[PDB]
Structure 1
Amino acid sequence: MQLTDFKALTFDCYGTLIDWETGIVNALQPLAKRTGKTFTSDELLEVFGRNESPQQTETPGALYQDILRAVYDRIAKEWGLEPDAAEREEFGTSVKNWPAFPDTVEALQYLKKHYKLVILSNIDRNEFKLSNAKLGVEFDHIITAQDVGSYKPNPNNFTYMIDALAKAGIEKKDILHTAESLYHDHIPANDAGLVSAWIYRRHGHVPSRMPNVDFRFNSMGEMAEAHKQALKG
């Protein structure tokens, strides 16, 4: 089991490459400032998570911005504020502002030399295009929840991706699924017969079980460095 056994990295974007948590903390600043209260990042993320839950659907909405706009309205109400149209507009379009983790770009640029790179995203393709502009590489394949008709961890998202890759010449055994989320990514990766690289980020949705993972790295940078070390012998 070696990182060189694989030809394609199939990535989660949001949570693995793009730091959605920081993006949401930042995006909540205008509304939060209006409350006059000071929140910790964990507090903001708790409020976001609890208010995004009721927006979840089986068939994905075409535009992720509609989820964010609905969450904005709910949070403003929770905080005892009237929603503001301008604030809602900005919050709803905030994905483009969500930052890459500081290690992401250099790691992707290195890994792009050696692997076919794939995105499997629950956020729509147009938002991803805006994130892609700050990720520093071209992706070979981009698969979204809208394409599939469901959100990961639905197994169809993985089957669709695997089938797309097979048509592009990549056998299932040559895929390394690289992601932060045990629940959204590694449980279904296990069930789809993929090998997993867990990019654990800040570790330490509740996964029903702990999935098997074959590699563990704190960041994409660490994964890239492990590849470099592997090549050294």
Structure 2
Amino acid sequence: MRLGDYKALSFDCYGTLIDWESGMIEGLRELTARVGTDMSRDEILQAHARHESRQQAQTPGKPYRDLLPIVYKRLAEQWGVPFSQAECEEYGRSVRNWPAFVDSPGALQYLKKYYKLIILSNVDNKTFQYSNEKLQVEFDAIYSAEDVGAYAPSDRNFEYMNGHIGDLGLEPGDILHTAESLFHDHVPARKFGMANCWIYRRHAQEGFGATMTPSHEPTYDFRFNSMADLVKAHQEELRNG
């Protein structure tokens, strides 16, 4: 029950470290403006969650940068608005510009001093390098959907990570999986018997945003509203332990 009991943290990226909700809102705004500005942020995010999760199941080996153009098309068609294939492909390129949460770089730099840092992310490797540059830290391992050939919450993603962490000198019990998404991360993490830390980025925001409603709310061993609060809790453990 202590953060210091773990040798490594594994992180989801998009939603936990990178603010993908703000990033996709910006990437979609020319399209959503054709619908109308009355359509709310939550409606946009949930419509994207629906098409993204379904397309990730349909074509699990498609690189994320090539999958999001299809999601853009599905949304435009659902909303009945004109669009172009060029706009679709540009949207898939927009991921590299999705911004970090402002607390993520400093938090990751702090945590690097105490833990090996692992990424488990629904992304392609070419795209992720740009997010990695925004995060300003070296990851001990990056396990991407491209490496896996499937997208979380597929069993294959945790299985792939578990099959490689031995190369880092780690076993599954050494790792605290740290993530925002109940659907993508915490349901599978609990299925795999992982210890888990919920970074509840949407603590003040109604609904699930860009993640799907999970089949159930899974258990979590730790919860914090931000990466900055995770770091403060680690500092508190060292100060008072």
Q: Is 1:207 aligned to 2:214, yes or no?
A: yes
8 Å contact from structure 2 (residues 56, 150) kept in 1: no
Letter in structure 2 aligned against 1:45: L
8 Å contact from structure 2 (residues 55, 67) kept in 1: yes
CA distance in 2, matches of 1:221, 1:56: 31
The range that moved more, 34-43 or 196-205, is 34-43
CA distance in 2, matches of 1:191, 1:61: 23
Q: 3-state DSSP class of the match of 1:62? A: coil
Shift of 1:91: 1.2
Aligned residue number for residue 230 of structure 1: 237
The range that moved more, 85-94 or 1-10, is 85-94
Q: 3-state DSSP class of the match of 2:45? A: helix
- Provide Cα deviations, 1:75-107, integer angstroms capped at 9, x if missing partner: 223333321344333212110111111211111
Q: CA RMSD in A?
A: 1.9
Q: 3-state DSSP class of the match of 1:134? A: helix
CA distance in 2, matches of 1:187, 1:229: 28
Aligned residue number for residue 79 of structure 1: 79
CA distance in 1, matches of 2:53, 2:188: 20
8 Å contact from structure 1 (residues 58, 150) kept in 2: no
Letter in structure 2 aligned against 1:8: A
In the superposition, relative to structure 1, how do residues 186 and 34 fare at CA in structure 2: closer, same or farther (>3 Å)?
Answer: closer
Q: How does 1:17-166 map to 2 (within 5 A)?
A: 17-35=17-35, 37-57=37-57, 60-166=60-166
Calculate the TM-score normalised by the size of structure 1: 0.91
Q: Structure 1 vs Structure 2: percent identity of aligned residues?
A: 54
Shift of 1:62: 3.3
List runs of 5+ in structure 1 lacking aligned partners: none
List runs of 5+ in structure 2 lacking aligned partners: 207-211
Calculate the TM-score normalised by the size of structure 2: 0.88
CA distance in 1, matches of 2:38, 2:196: 39
CA distance in 2, matches of 1:108, 1:81: 41
Aligned residues: 233
In the superposition, relative to structure 1, how do residues 231 and 37 fare at CA in structure 2: closer, same or farther (>3 Å)?
Answer: closer
Q: 3-state DSSP class of the match of 1:117? A: strand
Aligned residue number for residue 7 of structure 1: 7
Shift of 1:59: 5.3
Shift of 1:165: 1.1
Letter in structure 2 aligned against 1:123: V
Letter in structure 1 aligned against 2:45: L
Letter in structure 2 aligned against 1:178: T
